[PDB]
């Protein structure tokens, strides 16, 4: 087998290939969460519509599980590898414990495997980081960020991949309680965000929501264009 | 051996004899079948108690491990099922275990019945054992599930006692536990002499 | 242990340098050349040999892989060699399997497959050499050339090694299909002394061909009289 | 040896594989393909870049790849990487057939090729696969689909696209031309041979220099049917008579 | 950058890591085998880097099998490993053909041994080079010495080490077919004794064994008695 | 640049590798243990990066047995592994020989981890590069409150107060001029509470730090956020 | 040996089975229930020797969820059974033979109600009604007779009924109360034991 | 026997430009009728057909294995197989498992692709072919099957003589058989038509 | 600077420069002293503690009943090391019920050591090592290298700035043949106590003694229990 060691420590003890593959994830599309107190709410900043493309087949939010979501930003093919792990996981836990998984699980193990490839043999990091939404066993909402390095934390809201920084600090300015409090003020809330980091606004964005006790909804394309009109009432 | 568990308002009862026997002798009469999995949930040993022993030992050692991964007390069912799933790696090699595992959780008072032949369930009412047969009757037909503490710690020791009676192979004394919300507490341990002097 | 890792990857313009520079040792093997005819298909090739000492019986560029697949080759003989034993075994693979004779573009495929194996294994150059596979099957003849990057291609006549540029213009003037095997390979050893460079004779050729009996390579004394005119 | 080692699939600086790009860029030279779904059918048209006269015609195709009862790939890239990809695509498909006795999807065909593709991007010390090739397939759940996948193996379903040489003008022509559920088989075929010319360097398309393909239902059964050279001729005189008539418009 | 490698070649067809390895042994002390009628005797001019060794320290003399016997010139550590795989083979061929090992088939098979490290890159050559000596009635007395690139010839005298040259020419004044093991190990001492350099080298300990009719088909160290007289013979000759 | 191997001694005879992990722990955030006759404490700076980062989820101290707990610093990932193999190295020997594992025995279970990474000629499964922590490992045994730092090196030494981190420098000043062997478990809280409030960039809060302590009589605790005010508005 | 009874219809498929759980002489459960939910539209029925049952279930549940998850869309009937065909078989001549019976009932869109019946062996077949265990001797003969393709599914409910009656007079065993399920287009449908 | 345990029968027979392969219905297990729909025969080409008798398990796991690798054969040959090819793959695959054998008894009758010339052959539980020239037959029912077509076939029958052969064969010979019966069906090859039919028969 | 990367390359001069430099990792440690006497094998080492605060760093070992160790280098290599030499001497007493001879196994950690330095993507142990023990010969001390080299020494001295000691060694080596064990101990004290720096002075915190004698199993005298070995030591001006 091919046994080589594709990270390493540098002098000033920084790992290149992890911070080179954050800056993967720096170039992908938007991705923006927002935690909310009945809903958590996951939005992607469509990187262009061709116009040609099967919105399907496109899709970046993706569903783990039942109980949980995930979105990402970086090379989609490695999202695709993660998510499909991370779906195996999700049944074999439920096999060998007769429960749902919990978010901070799935979590664990996606943090788990992307830090094996930072530190194993003959791989290169997973060029990417998740947004993993979910509900636990209580209802509590629950959202976390994943990184190429494998770090793993809890974020009310957060964004990743192109902009994040810029939205960022948005969310971090216009996060309260009152936004929390209503789904549709969340939804508009993660439209607002995506829509400073998306020139185009309208259906250049992919939002999702999912409730307590509900799957993964994925909004229809007239659903957003009608939330992004009614942002355009609240300017005026 | 004769084991005993039920599930009550008030809990989950377990009780069980303290006889090991090698053939006819009786190589102890002091054994603790009840085993102290953990402070939280707690199982019973028949058929062989070398099996039945390490088993519910390693099962002990990996739900410690699920507290301090996930930060939570692992379910009674999901016990259950990693010592089901650890002893069918093992099956037709004569592996012979019979278990009761005995706790609660978010679902409430779980009782599981667990076995080497691979039968996991999940019931108000179980005993295992070669007295399990004589202790099942009584059990049943004292057992509600609207029964005082007072009443089931009663129920289950003379449920013990007659299969002692009737059953060459389990004597010695009657253990008792009792689960509650917070844990298991050792309640009682009579011999089956002094039982003898007050049911008679 | 080995090596695991390619030694062949794309460079800035996307190209396997590698495979090319296999090709350009194909090109400065010996000429090989190739023509099917409507009742067959001959394979000859030059055999060109550094002095009189040399023994031109003892080993033979026209090798037969089965009783009706045979082929032919300009490049790396080591190559070469490796790789008929491997097309051999490939062919009786099949053979145990099906109880039929390997289809000739059945081969080419597996051969092909082996040296797409060579390009991208770890530790391991591409094969130095070119195939020409002369088949006969379900009454209808075949030519194949499989090259160093494993990518076959079915010509009705070409040629391979030093000037095949030049034979394959000559043999496009000089091509009918309604060809017969004997006038075919007429035509390919007039291709050979097109770019041999030297008085032809039996020793100092190979000529191959296959027919409904099978594949064959012409003795000295067949080639000989085919060399008269 | 570290000395001698290539070390494809570490990151670059600026966060690129740069091993997956360097084989785009050697898929961007290579022969044109295209395909464009319709409503009753889907077809893959290709350049069929060898065309040497001596050059024999005995196959299916040059780069149509029947996979399965139901689905069809052309290819644009390396050919040998191509073979090893469609023959590990066929039992893909086989296997899928053993496990569930159905057809495959088309879209988890083209995932686990994709998987594979990508696998090689990660790790093993191995060169990508230097292909792109387009899928297209009839499947219960969806419909008829077209899909694309690339180096890297990222993968997309399209309604029209294109690969290879000058596919970019290719997309460029077909998305002005292509109309959302208003396209039928005739029409895909017309608008195909229109971007084969124009992305085809060589000014007649000859006839010989393309290999069509369509893929339709009929009957309950997938038929997959690579066109005749007396039908795309037919195909190629009738869009240059159309260019004739617009020229008469023009005038 | 042709030399980094011993799966490489110089443009003139050079395998310089080898080379390398023979710089190795070259630096190492001289050591000396003389072959007889009646046997081998080896002979090691072992430093004494410290006062504070004991005596007997980086034993220089090894016992490959009961019936053959080591001297070894360079990395000693190299040297100790070629010794177990030696003793390995011995007692593996003993097992499966039921009889001591020739002397020829050892050098032969830990010569082919060496040799499988010179060809890979993984690998590098061994920086030791060994005489082997031994004794038997029916093969008469054998000595042969192994480079580091695995050429094994066999020797009526040999050294190996930084006064290999000068050795030879002591050792090839010898007649040493007729001599017996006796008299040849005085000889032995007296030419380690003048190959040692006193200045460069702070002291040694003459390290003498041999094989032969007189031990009677064993690898011996010499007897101390038999020592002192070679070594009291060597000092008296040195002058 | 790869031109030389993860096992390479420097002319001066360091693996280059352990030397640049040992870099590499200055960039993490600091950490403070105190080892007293009453107990260990272990302090933490969470180094919250933004507000809506939930703080709670920072996990900088961890509890591998219910007598021994271990605060970390550096590339937190590669804590969670050693971590691991301290759990379940303490539940095997309580499986084996049903007793408590000491805080030497585990320190050098995980140290024994360290140094063995190796590009090839190791295993399917092996380290590529020294893990890029340092551990504090606090507990309570049969010779008492015990503290052990264990570096990326592998070495493992007992401390009685030890800082690890970025300001580790400064702060081992500060707790060499503030400790003394007779020191209580609270004024130790205090000191190394003092001494964080002194190297941290932000003003210490409840919510910026993590301190737990565990006791002769007690399992490992952590001290949830009203303890935290409680001792703050304390000192 | 516990019992398994599937009647298709028109448009739904019923399923029943016993309730009891037994060690030696006595039945240790009364309330365990043999169906296993391996999706919204389909039904696993499993008897068979201990541990057997629920691992092999359990690992055929895992997989079709993980289809669902994976892919977007539910295996149908036909697949789900072909899949679990091949993990029985590929496992009758390993080391592990799963000894379990399989009764497996589901609807499609497409393709309507459909039962399916597997044997320990692993030979899948396609039945209008079928059952396993040894009261399938007693009770198929009733089906037999009083079966018409297009039943109602009242109907079909009260000939379960009398099918378990007459497991109830003749068979030796106690099975004193049966679960009764039915899939149909809607989902599955729980309805009310069938006691005695 | 093992092979007795789910039973069953196929028949095949050769006429003139023509192939006839039949089998019975029945499904059972030792003495239990599950289903009278069971599918022995599989269409393995355009007018190659595969029938199975033995285990079922092993009938419908042989059948899905050839299946398998005949549409890789065929996919990447880009031609349709031939019956002596098809009996050699078979054999092949059977032999591979020669321990722990499939306990099935394959017979592979149809035209060939080009000549259109009648094969029918069968081969054993480990893959020792007989290819013939008149019939064919693998069962439980083998005897009877066998002194029934001894008797009746004749060479060069017409379709319609070989339908009315191999059904009155099938039908008096499964009559006579416990573990066979529930119903027969037929296939009749010819090169331009497949006619299937079932036939009337004892459901004892 | 081409040659020292990798541990296969031999360098133009007949040398490996990496293993050289594991050399000089040993010599980058705190210093140990190894002594023996006719009846006595004595271990003493320098301790060295990072802080204040810190703990000194267990320099001696346990491997057998009869065999001890002294570590300088890296301590995880060490430990390795120690580890395989338990393990061969456990193997030992299991299989012939002996105490393995100690000129054995340091020859199998020779053998050890000896595989990393002549293969790729392995190093040397950087450790040299000072082993101690009591056999059937005798008393016995033996030092061993990152170079799987081996000696068998009369005392000896390994770590920093340890010259000096071995120069005190080899002026009173006539001394320490013939002694008691008080008289040696007390030798190998100063001797190590020259390596320290004159500013610091032996203390019980920062030495540690290790003894194994005919009667005595390797002991291994802590902080506590060497006071009554340098209760002399009288100056070092």
Same mark, same amino acid.
């Given at each position: 087998s091919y046994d080589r060691a594709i990270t390493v420590f540098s002098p000033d003890g920084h790992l290149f290939q992890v911070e080179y593959a954050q800056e993967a994830v720096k170039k992908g599309s938007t991705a923006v969460g927002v935690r909310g107190r009945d809903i958590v709410v996951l939005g992607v900043e469509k990187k262009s519509v061709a116009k040609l493309q099967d919105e399907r087949t496109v899709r970046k939010i993706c569903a783990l599980d039942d109980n949980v979501c995930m979105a990402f930003a970086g090379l989609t093919a490695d999202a695709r590898i993660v998510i499909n792990r991370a779906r195996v996981e999700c049944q074999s836990h439920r096999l060998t414990v007769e429960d749902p998984v919990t978010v901070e699980y799935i979590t664990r193990y996606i943090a788990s495997l992307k830090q094996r490839y930072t530190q194993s043999n003959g791989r290169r990091p997973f060029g990417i980081s998740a947004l993993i939404v979910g509900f636990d066993f209580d209802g509590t909402p629950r959202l976390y960020q994943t990184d190429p390095s494998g770090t793993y934390h809890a974020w009310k809201a957060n964004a990743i991949g192109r902009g994040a920084k810029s939205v960022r600090e948005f969310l971090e300015k216009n996060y309260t309680d009152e936004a929390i409090e209503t789904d549709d003020l969340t939804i508009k809330l993660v439209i607002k965000a995506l829509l400073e980091v998306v020139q185009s606004g309208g259906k250049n964005i992919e939002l999702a929501v999912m409730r307590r006790d509900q799957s993964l909804k994925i909004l229809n394309p007239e659903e957003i264009e009608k939330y992004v009109a009614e942002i355009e009432k609240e300017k005026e | 051996?004769?084991?005993?568990?039920?599930?009550?308002?008030?809990?989950?009862?377990?009780?069980?004899?303290?006889?090991?026997?090698?053939?006819?002798?009786?190589?102890?009469?002091?054994?603790?079948?009840?085993?102290?999995?953990?402070?939280?949930?707690?199982?019973?040993?028949?058929?062989?108690?070398?099996?039945?022993?390490?088993?519910?030992?390693?099962?002990?050692?990996?739900?410690?491990?699920?507290?301090?991964?996930?930060?939570?007390?692992?379910?009674?069912?999901?016990?259950?099922?990693?010592?089901?799933?650890?002893?069918?790696?093992?099956?037709?090699?004569?592996?012979?275990?019979?278990?009761?595992?005995?706790?609660?959780?978010?679902?409430?008072?779980?009782?599981?019945?667990?076995?080497?032949?691979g039968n996991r369930i999940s019931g108000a009412t179980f005993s295992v054992g070669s007295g399990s047969v004589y202790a099942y009757g009584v059990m049943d037909r004292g057992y509600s599930y609207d029964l005082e503490v007072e009443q089931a710690y009663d129920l289950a020791r003379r449920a013990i006692y007659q299969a002692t009676y009737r059953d060459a192979y389990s004597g010695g004394a009657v253990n008792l536990y009792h689960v509650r919300e917070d844990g298991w507490i050792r309640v009682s341990s009579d011999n089956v002499a002094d039982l003898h002097e007050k049911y008679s | 242990r080995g090596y695991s890792f390619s030694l062949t990857t794309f460079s800035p313009s996307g190209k396997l340098v590698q495979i090319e520079y296999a090709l350009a040792a194909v090109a400065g093997g010996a000429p090989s050349v190739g023509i099917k005819a409507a009742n067959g298909v001959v394979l000859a090739t030059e055999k060109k040999q550094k002095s009189?000492?040399?023994?031109?019986?003892?080993?033979?560029?026209?090798?037969?892989? /089965?009783?009706?697949?045979?082929?032919?080759?300009?490049?790396?003989?080591?190559?070469?060699?490796?790789?008929?034993?491997?097309?051999?075994?490939?062919?009786?693979?099949?053979?145990?399997?099906?109880?039929?004779?390997?289809? /000739?573009?059945?081969?080419?495929?597996?051969?092909?497959?082996?040296?797409?194996?060579? /390009?991208?294994?770890?530790?391991?150059?591409?094969?130095?050499?070119?195939?020409?596979?002369?088949?006969?099957?379900?009454?209808?003849?075949?030519?194949?050339?499989?090259?160093?990057?494993?990518?076959?291609?079915?010509?009705?006549? /070409?040629?391979?090694?030093?000037?095949?540029?030049?034979?394959?213009t000559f043999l496009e003037k000089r091509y009918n299909e309604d060809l017969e095997l004997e006038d075919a390979i007429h035509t390919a050893i007039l291709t050979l002394k097109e770019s041999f460079e030297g008085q032809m004779t039996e020793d100092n050729i190979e000529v191959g061909i296959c027919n409904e009996a099978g594949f064959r390579r012409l003795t000295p004394t067949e080639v000989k009289d085919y060399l008269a005119a | 040896s570290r000395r001698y080692d290539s070390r494809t699939t570490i990151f670059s600086p600026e966060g690129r594989l740069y091993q997956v790009e360097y084989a785009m860029e050697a898929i961007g030279h290579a022969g044109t393909c295209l395909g464009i779904l319709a409503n009753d059918g889907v077809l893959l048209a290709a350049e069929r870049r060898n065309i040497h006269k001596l050059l024999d015609e005995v196959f299916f195709s040059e780069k149509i790849y029947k996979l399965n009862e139901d689905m069809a790939c052309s290819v644009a890239g390396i050919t040998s990487d191509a073979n090893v990809l469609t023959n590990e695509l066929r039992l893909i498909a086989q296997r899928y057939l053993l496990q569930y006795q159905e057809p495959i999807p088309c879209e988890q065909l083209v995932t686990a090729l994709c998987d594979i593709k990508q696998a090689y991007t990660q790790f093993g010390g191995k060169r990508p696969f230097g292909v792109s090739l387009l899928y297209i397939g009839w499947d219960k759940h969806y419909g008829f689909q077209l899909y694309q996948s690339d180096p890297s193996g990222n993968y997309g379903g399209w309604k029209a696209t294109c690969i290879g040489n000058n596919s970019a003008a290719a997309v460029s022509m077909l998305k002005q031309d292509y109309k959302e559920g208003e396209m039928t088989l005739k029409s895909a075929l017309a608008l195909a041979i229109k971007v084969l010319n124009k992305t085809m360097d060589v000014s007649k398309l000859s006839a010989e220099k393309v290999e069509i393909a369509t893929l339709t239902r009929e009957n309950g059964k997938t038929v997959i049917r690579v066109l005749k050279q007396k039908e795309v001729e037919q195909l190629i005189k009738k869009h240059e008579e159309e260019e004739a008539k617009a020229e008469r418009e023009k005038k | 950058g042709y030399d980094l490698s011993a799966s490489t070649f110089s443009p003139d067809g050079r395998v310089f890591q080898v080379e390398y390895a023979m710089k190795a042994v070259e630096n190492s002390s001289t050591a000396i085998g003389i072959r007889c009628k009646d046997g081998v005797v080896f002979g090691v001019e072992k430093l004494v880097l410290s006062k504070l060794y004991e005596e007997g320290s980086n034993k220089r003399l090894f016992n490959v099998d009961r019936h053959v016997g080591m001297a070894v010139a360079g990395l000693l550590a190299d040297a100790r490993s070629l010794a177990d795989i030696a003793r390995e083979e011995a007692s593996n061929f003993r097992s499966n053909f039921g009889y001591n090992i020739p002397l020829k088939h050892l050098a032969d098979r830990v010569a082919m041994y060496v040799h499988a490290y010179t060809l890979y890159s993984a690998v590098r050559p061994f920086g030791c080079s060994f005489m082997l000596g031994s004794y038997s009635v029916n093969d008469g007395a054998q000595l042969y010495m192994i480079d580091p690139s695995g050429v094994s010839y066999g020797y009526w005298g040999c050294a190996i080490g930084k006064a290999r040259q000068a050795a030879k020419t002591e050792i090839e004044k010898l007649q040493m077919k007729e001599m017996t093991c006796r008299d040849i190990v005085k000889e032995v001492a007296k030419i380690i004794y003048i190959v040692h350099d006193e200045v460069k080298d702070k002291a040694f300990e003459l390290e003498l064994s041999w094989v032969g009719e007189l031990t009677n088909g064993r690898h011996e160290i010499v007897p101390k008695d038999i020592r002192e007289e070679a070594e009291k013979y060597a000092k008296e000759s040195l002058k | 640049e790869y031109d030389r191997g993860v096992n390479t001694f420097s002319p001066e005879g360091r693996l280059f590798q352990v030397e640049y992990a040992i870099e590499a722990i200055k960039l993490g955030s600091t950490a403070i243990g105190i080892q007293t006759s009453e107990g260990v404490c272990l302090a933490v700076e969470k180094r919250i990066t933004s507000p809506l980062m939930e703080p709670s989820s920072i996990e900088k101290i961890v509890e591998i047995d219910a007598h021994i707990g271990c605060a970390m610093s550096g590339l937190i990932a590669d804590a969670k592994t050693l971590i691991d193999k301290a759990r379940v190295e303490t539940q095997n020997h309580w499986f084996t020989y049903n007793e408590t594992m000491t805080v030497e025995s585990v320190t050098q279970a995980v140290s024994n981890l360290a140094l063995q990474f190796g590009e090839?000629?190791?295993?399917?499964?092996?380290?590529? *590069?020294?893990?890029?922590?340092?551990?504090?490992?606090?507990?309570?045994?049969?010779?008492?409150?015990?503290?052990?730092?264990?570096?990326?090196?592998?070495?493992?030494?007992?401390?009685?107060? *030890?800082?690890?981190?970025? @300001?580790?420098?400064?702060?081992?000043?500060?707790?060499?001029?503030?400790?003394?062997?007779?020191?209580?478990?609270?004024? @130790?809280?205090?000191?190394?509470?003092?001494?964080?409030?002194?190297?941290?960039?932000?003003?210490? %809060?409840?919510? %910026?730090?993590?301190?737990?302590?565990?006791?002769?009589?007690? %399992?490992?605790?952590?001290?949830?956020?009203?303890?935290?005010?409680?001792?703050?508005?304390?000192? | 040996m516990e019992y398994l009874i599937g009647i298709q219809g028109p448009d739904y498929v019923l399923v029943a089975s016993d309730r009891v759980a037994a060690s030696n002489i006595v039945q240790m459960k009364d309330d365990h229930d043999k169906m296993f939910k391996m999706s919204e539209k389909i039904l696993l029925l499993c008897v068979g020797e201990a541990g057997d049952t629920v691992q092999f279930a359990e690992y055929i549940q895992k997989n079709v969820q993980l289809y669902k998850m994976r892919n977007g869309y539910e295996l149908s009937p036909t697949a789900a059974a072909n899949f679990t065909r091949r993990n029985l078989a590929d496992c009758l001549r390993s080391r592990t033979p799963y000894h379990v019976n399989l009764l497996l009932a589901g609807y499609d869109e497409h393709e309507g109600p459909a039962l399916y019946y597997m044997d320990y062996l692993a030979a899948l077949a396609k039945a209008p009604f079928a059952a396993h265990g040894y009261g399938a001797f007693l009770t198929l003969s009733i089906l037999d007779r009083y079966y018409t393709p297009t039943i109602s599914r009242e109907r079909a409910v009260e000939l379960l009924r009398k099918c378990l009656e007459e497991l109830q007079k003749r068979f030796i065993l106690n099975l004193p109360t049966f679960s009764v399920r039915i899939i149909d287009k809607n989902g599955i449908h729980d309805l009310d034991n069938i006691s005695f | 026997s093992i092979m007795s345990y789910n039973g069953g029968a196929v028949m095949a027979m050769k006429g003139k430009n023509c192939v006839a392969i039949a089998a019975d219905r029945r499904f059972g297990i030792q003495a239990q009728m599950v289903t009278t729909d069971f599918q022995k025969i599989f269409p393995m080409g355009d007018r190659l057909y595969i029938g199975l008798a033995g285990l079922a398990t092993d009938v419908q796991t042989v059948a899905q294995r050839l299946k398998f690798r005949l549409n890789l054969y065929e996919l990447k040959e880009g031609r349709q197989i031939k019956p002596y090819t098809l009996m050699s793959m078979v054999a092949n695959l059977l032999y591979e498992k020669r321990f722990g054998p499939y306990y099935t008894e394959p017979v592979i009758a149809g035209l060939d692709p080009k000549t259109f010339k009648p094969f029918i052959c069968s081969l054993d539980l480990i893959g020792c072919p007989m290819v013939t020239d008149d019939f064919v037959v693998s069962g439980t029912c083998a005897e009877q099957m066998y002194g029934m077509c001894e008797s009746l076939w004749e060479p060069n029958m017409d379709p319609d003589h070989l339908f009315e052969t191999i059904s009155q064969a099938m039908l008096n010979a499964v009559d006579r058989d416990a573990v066979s019966g529930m119903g027969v069906i037929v296939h009749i090859i010819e090169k331009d038509k497949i006619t299937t039919r079932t036939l009337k028969a004892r459901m004892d | 600077n081409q040659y020292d990367n990798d541990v296969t390359v031999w360098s133009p001069q007949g040398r490996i420069h990496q293993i050289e430099y594991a050399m000089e990792a040993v010599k980058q440690g705190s210093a140990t002293v190894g002594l023996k006497s006719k009846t006595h094998a004595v271990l003493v080492a320098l301790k060295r503690a990072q802080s204040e605060l810190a703990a000194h760093q267990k320099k001696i070992l346990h491997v057998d009943n009869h065999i001890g160790i002294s570590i300088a280098g890296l301590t995880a290599d060490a430990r390795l090391l120690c580890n395989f030499m338990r393990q061969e001497c456990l193997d030992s007493r299991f299989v012939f019920d002996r105490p393995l001879p100690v000129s054995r196994l340091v020859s199998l950690i020779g053998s050890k050591t000896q595989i990393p330095t002549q293969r790729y993507g392995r190093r040397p142990y950087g450790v040299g090592l000072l082993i101690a023990g009591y056999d059937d010969m005798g008393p016995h001390i033996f030092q061993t290298c990152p170079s799987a080299n081996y000696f068998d020494c009369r005392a000896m001295s390994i770590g920093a700035r340890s010259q000096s000691a071995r120069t005190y060694l080899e002026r009173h080596m006539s001394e320490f043949m013939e002694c008691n064990l008080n008289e040696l101990v007390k030798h190998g004290l100063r001797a190590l106590r020259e390596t320290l720096p004159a500013?610091?002075?032996?203390?019980?915190?920062?030495?540690?003694?290790?003894?194994?004698?005919?009667?005595?199993?390797?002991?291994?005298?802590?902080?506590?229990?060497?006071?009554?070995?340098?209760?002399?030591?009288?100056?070092?001006?």
């Open positions: - | 051996t004769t084991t005993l568990a039920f599930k009550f308002r008030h809990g989950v009862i377990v009780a069980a004899d303290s006889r090991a026997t090698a053939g006819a002798y009786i190589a102890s009469q002091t054994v603790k079948k009840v085993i102290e999995i953990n402070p939280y949930l707690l199982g019973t040993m028949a058929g062989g108690a070398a099996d039945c022993s390490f088993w519910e030992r390693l099962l002990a050692r990996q739900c410690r491990i699920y507290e301090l991964r996930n930060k939570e007390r692992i379910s009674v069912a999901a016990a259950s099922k990693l010592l089901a799933n650890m002893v069918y790696q093992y099956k037709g090699m004569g592996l012979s275990m019979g278990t009761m595992i005995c706790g609660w959780d978010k679902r409430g008072p779980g009782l599981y019945y667990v076995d080497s032949e | 009189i000492l040399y023994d031109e019986r003892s080993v033979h560029k026209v090798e037969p892989i /089965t009783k009706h697949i045979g082929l032919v080759y300009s490049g790396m003989g080591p190559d070469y060699r490796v790789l008929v034993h491997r097309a051999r075994k490939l062919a009786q693979q099949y053979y145990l399997v099906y109880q039929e004779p390997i289809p /000739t573009a059945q081969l080419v495929q597996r051969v092909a497959s082996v040296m797409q194996e060579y /390009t991208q294994s770890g530790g391991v150059r591409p094969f130095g050499v070119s195939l020409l596979i002369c088949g006969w099957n379900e009454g209808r003849p075949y030519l194949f050339q499989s090259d160093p990057s494993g990518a076959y291609f079915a010509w009705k006549a /070409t040629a391979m090694g030093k000037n095949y540029v030049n034979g394959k | - | - | 090839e000629d190791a295993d399917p499964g092996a380290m590529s *590069r020294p893990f890029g922590v340092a551990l504090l490992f606090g507990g309570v045994d049969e010779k008492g409150p015990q503290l052990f730092h264990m570096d990326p090196s592998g070495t493992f030494v007992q401390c009685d107060a *030890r800082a690890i981190g970025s @300001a580790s420098e400064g702060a081992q000043s500060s707790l060499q001029e503030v400790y003394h062997k007779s020191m209580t478990l609270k004024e @130790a809280i205090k000191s190394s509470l003092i001494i964080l409030k002194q190297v941290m960039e932000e003003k210490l %809060n409840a919510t %910026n730090i993590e301190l737990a302590t565990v006791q002769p009589g007690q %399992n490992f605790h952590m001290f949830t956020k009203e303890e935290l005010e409680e001792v703050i508005k304390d000192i | - | - | 500013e610091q002075d032996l203390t019980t915190k920062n030495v540690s003694i290790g003894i194994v004698g005919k009667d005595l199993e390797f002991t291994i005298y802590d902080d506590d229990d060497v006071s009554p070995f340098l209760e002399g030591l009288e100056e070092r001006p």
